[PDB]
Amino acid sequence: IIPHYTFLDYYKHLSYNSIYHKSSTYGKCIAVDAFIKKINETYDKVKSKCNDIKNDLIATIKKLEHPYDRTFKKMMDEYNTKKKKLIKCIKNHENDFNKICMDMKNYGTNLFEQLSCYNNNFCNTNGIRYHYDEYIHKLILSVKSKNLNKDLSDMTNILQQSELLLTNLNKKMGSYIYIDTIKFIHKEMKHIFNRIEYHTKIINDKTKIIQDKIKLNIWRTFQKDELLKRILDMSNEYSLFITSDHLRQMLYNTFYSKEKHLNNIFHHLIYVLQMK
Amino acid sequence: RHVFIRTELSFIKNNVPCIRDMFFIYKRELYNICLDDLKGEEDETHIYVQKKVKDSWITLNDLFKETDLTGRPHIFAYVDVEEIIILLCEDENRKKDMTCHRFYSNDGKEYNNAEITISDYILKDKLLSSYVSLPLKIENREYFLICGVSPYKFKDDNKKDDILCMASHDKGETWGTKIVIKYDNYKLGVQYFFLRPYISKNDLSFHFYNFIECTHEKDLEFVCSNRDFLKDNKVLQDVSTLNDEYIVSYGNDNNFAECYIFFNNENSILIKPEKTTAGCYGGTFVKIDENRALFIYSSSQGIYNIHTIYYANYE
């Protein structure tokens, strides 16, 4: 869950960015990374309770996408009704999901208690320097390392050109329910294209916001509460950054796996119906 | 302006149908390559090489006994007037190591066969089917070619990787030559279909599902320039040339009902397969010499009907 994902990663950075003021705590990351293990266990396995019949629903995408190697609407009804079963499954394991993420509120804020200062007018920046730099700043170099705007020009061209094959080849082939399934896949990659597109604007806007905000954080001091305001604030920068990029990689894998998928779909039809 | 076109008609029969057929001139004898595209209980591949001896198709020899089951296949014949080389290679799923088989004759009946092995063919992610081809002389030798087209490219990264022409040098014994074609009208997202390269007068010509007149650029790199033949539902389906100007038929509809032929924008006569419940598909502008031609299509089950052309210039 996206604001839960912001919430979990946010309180992870309140956690660690709290507990690296104290330079003697270099081994507590075993305990808190072990709680990242704990939330992968509880969070990920509760959201795999829905992957009984949602992994069966990935197998239902297999039921769709090859007959060998009308009911578009009629079993589209079953698909969306079982999608009321999807957000219903989220809705009734929702008990468990809120327990998990608000337990990250729990251990997270109880790790915010673990920060202190010798004096409140000025404190250390061993914390945000050591944890931003030694845990975050290379991911900042990862998303900074990619021209995902020209790659949005690539994926933009993927929807454009794929609408060209859809145009001239739906304009030619048409015949069986293949066109309906192809259109479902194409609009799916267009919704994901919207996701990728705005989260690339989180890259262009928000990554620049990390660039702007990053000067006021490390190698300095504050009156303590302003420094803490930048622990929460930069923890939000980290939350939307990491959440946006993990979205970008799930949809990146599913994206280009679908690129080989529909690629061989356009290199799949003439091989069957043999035009002429 | 000043052209005299003597057009005329003839008739063939065949007892069983053959859908996709190949036509040419060998020693001025009307020949054929039949189709049995049935892989079922009572029919297999049965490709009969048929001469029309004055009324109807007479199979000069069969082809299924040599290549036992390999493959679908794709048929390629090169028209020398003394010899014709025929290869057979199947449809595309993993393998590039592609042992095929080679045919030789000097008649239509007595065939010499030849085991070849075209292993790691370079037409992976290229698309080809059967068509008639000719020799084609570049400065050293006449040459025989196999031109695999790229059907779809995402990006127009290069206009060189469109049509990939593996060429021979020794009648088709060894194919140690690859030839590049440049296509300048490469519209992305428009997956070009079913390339048909025909040969006219030691020059290059590609046609597909548009027309492109084609010319030499390099020893291996060639090019195609663009040229219109498109009007209101008037597709281009076959074109030959006499005196290097085109002769045009049409597919007027999607049923291939009755093809439309003009006298090079001067006059017009009409194809009349009724004076039934069939079409004019499969039309073959068979090329004889500088001044004579033929035309044969496929209308219904086992009936071919010749349209013969005599054409020179009075002025």
DSSP secondary structure letters along chain B: ---EEEEEEEEEE-SS--SS-B--BSSS-BEEE------SSS-----EEEEE-SSSEEEEEESTTTSSS--S-EEEEE--SS---EEEE--------B--EEEEESSSS-EEEEE--B-S-TTTT-B---EEE--EE-SS-EE-EEEEEP---SS---SSBSEEEEE-SSTTS---EEEEEEETT--TT-----------SS-EEEE---EEEEEE-SSSEEEEEE----BTTBEEEEEEEETTEEEEEEE-SSS--S-EEESSSS-EEE--S-------EEEEEEE-SSSEEEEEEE-BTTEEEEEEEEEE---
Q: Which residues contact A164 (CB under 8 A, 6 or more apart)?
A: B187, B188, B189, B190
Spatial distance between the Cα atoms of B237 and B204, rounded to a whole number of angstroms: 17
For residue A87, count other CB atoms closer than 10 A to its CB. Answer: 11
Does some domain include residue B100?
yes
Locus of tokens 């390392």:
A145
The Cα of A261 is separated from the nearest Cα of chain B by a number of Å equal to: 14
Spatial distance between the Cα atoms of A133 and A145, rounded to a whole number of angstroms: 16
Whether residues B260 and B222 share a domain: the answer is: no
Cα A91 to the center of its chain, rounded Å: 20
| B92 vs A contacts (CB less than 8 Å) | 271
User: Are A165 and B155 inside 8 Å of each other by CB?
Assistant: no
| Chain A contact for B154 (CB, 8 A cutoff) | yes
Q: How many CB pairs under 8 A join A and B?
A: 44
Whether residues B107 and B211 share a domain: the answer is: yes
CA quadruple B50, B52, B53, B58: dihedral sign: positive
What is the structure's resolution, reported in angstroms to one decimal?
7.2
For residue B294, count other CB atoms closer than 10 A to its CB. Answer: 20
Domain containing B15 equals 1-29+232-315
Q: Residue A253 has which token pair?
A: 């894998």
User: Are A164 and B193 inside 8 Å of each other by CB?
Assistant: no
| Chain A contact for B3 (CB, 8 A cutoff) | no
Does some domain include residue B60?
no
Domains in chain B, number: 2
CA distances from B100 to B44, B66, B70, B72, B197 (A): 18, 12, 7, 12, 22
Does some domain include residue A84?
no
Q: Considering CB atoms only, which of A158, A266, A271 is closest to B152?
A: A266
Does some domain include residue A80?
no
* Domain stops at, among B176, B205, B227: B227
User: Are A276 and B209 inside 8 Å of each other by CB?
Assistant: yes
Spatial distance between the Cα atoms of A176 and A244, rounded to a whole number of angstroms: 38
- Experimental determination technique: cryo-EM
Whether residues B88 and B195 share a domain: the answer is: yes
Does some domain include residue A86?
no
Spatial distance between the Cα atoms of B260 and B248, rounded to a whole number of angstroms: 8
Mutate which of A150, A158, A168 to disrupt the B interface (most B C-beta within 10 Å)?
A168
The amino acid that residue A255 corresponds to is F
Q: Residue A151 has which token pair?
A: 């790659």
Does some domain include residue B89?
yes
User: Are A164 and B190 inside 8 Å of each other by CB?
Assistant: yes
Does some domain include residue B72?
yes
| A157 vs B contacts (CB less than 8 Å) | 154-155
Whether residues B207 and B112 share a domain: the answer is: yes
Q: Considering CB atoms only, which of B92, B155, B191 is closest to A266?
A: B191
Bridging pattern class, strands B131-133 and B111-115: unpaired
Bridging pattern class, strands B131-133 and B74-78: parallel
Q: Contact, B91 vs A271, CB < 8 A? A: yes
Exposed (0-12), middle (13-18) or buried (19+): which is B208, by Cβ within 10 Å?
Answer: middle
Spatial distance between the Cα atoms of B154 and B7, rounded to a whole number of angstroms: 46
Cα A67 to the center of its chain, rounded Å: 32
User: Are A161 and B154 inside 8 Å of each other by CB?
Assistant: yes
Does some domain include residue B44?
no
Whether residues B82 and B175 share a domain: the answer is: yes
CA distances from A196 to A153, A206, A213, A246, A261 (A): 12, 14, 24, 11, 19
| Chain A contact for B193 (CB, 8 A cutoff) | yes
* Domain stops at, among B207, B227, B247: B227
Mutate which of B124, B186, B193 to disrupt the A interface (most A C-beta within 10 Å)?
B193
* Domain stops at, among B227, B249, B271: B227
For residue A271, count other CB atoms closer than 10 A to its CB. Answer: 13
Q: Is B24 left (phi over 0), alpha (psi -120 to 50) or beta?
A: beta
Q: Residue A60 has which token pair?
A: 């239902």
User: Are A271 and B92 inside 8 Å of each other by CB?
Assistant: yes
Q: Contact, B56 vs B12, CB < 8 A? A: yes
Concatenating the DSSP letter of every residue in B95-124 gives: ---B--EEEEESSSS-EEEEE--B-S-TTT
User: Are A276 and B194 inside 8 Å of each other by CB?
Assistant: yes
User: Are A165 and B209 inside 8 Å of each other by CB?
Assistant: no
Mutate which of A69, A155, A161 to disrupt the B interface (most B C-beta within 10 Å)?
A161
Spatial distance between the Cα atoms of B222 and B204, rounded to a whole number of angstroms: 9
Mutate which of A163, A256, A276 to disrupt the B interface (most B C-beta within 10 Å)?
A276
| Chain A contact for B94 (CB, 8 A cutoff) | no
3-state secondary structure chain A: CHHHHHHHHHHHHHHHHHHCCCCCCCCCHHHHHHHHHHHHHHHHHHHHHCHHHHHHHHHHHHHHHCCCCCHHHHHHHHHHHHHHHHHHHHHHCHHHHHHHHHHHHHHHHHHHCCCCCCCCCCCCCCHHHHHHHHHCHHHHHHHHCCCHHHHHHHHHHHHHHHHHHHHHHHCCCCCCCHHHHHHHHHHHHHHHHHHHHHHHHHHHHHHHHHHHHHHHCCCCCCCHHHHHHHHHHHHHHHHHHHHHHHHHHHHHHHHHHHHHHHHHHHCCCHHHHCCC
Beta bridge partners of B310: B6, B292
Whether residues B126 and B79 share a domain: the answer is: yes
Q: Considering CB atoms only, which of A164, A263, A267 is closest to B188?
A: A164
Domain containing A221 equals 2-50+93-273
Domains in chain A, number: 1
Does some domain include residue B237?
yes
Spatial distance between the Cα atoms of B31 and A223, rounded to a whole number of angstroms: 98
Whether residues B135 and B251 share a domain: the answer is: no
CA angle B40/B85/B192 to nearest 5° reads 65
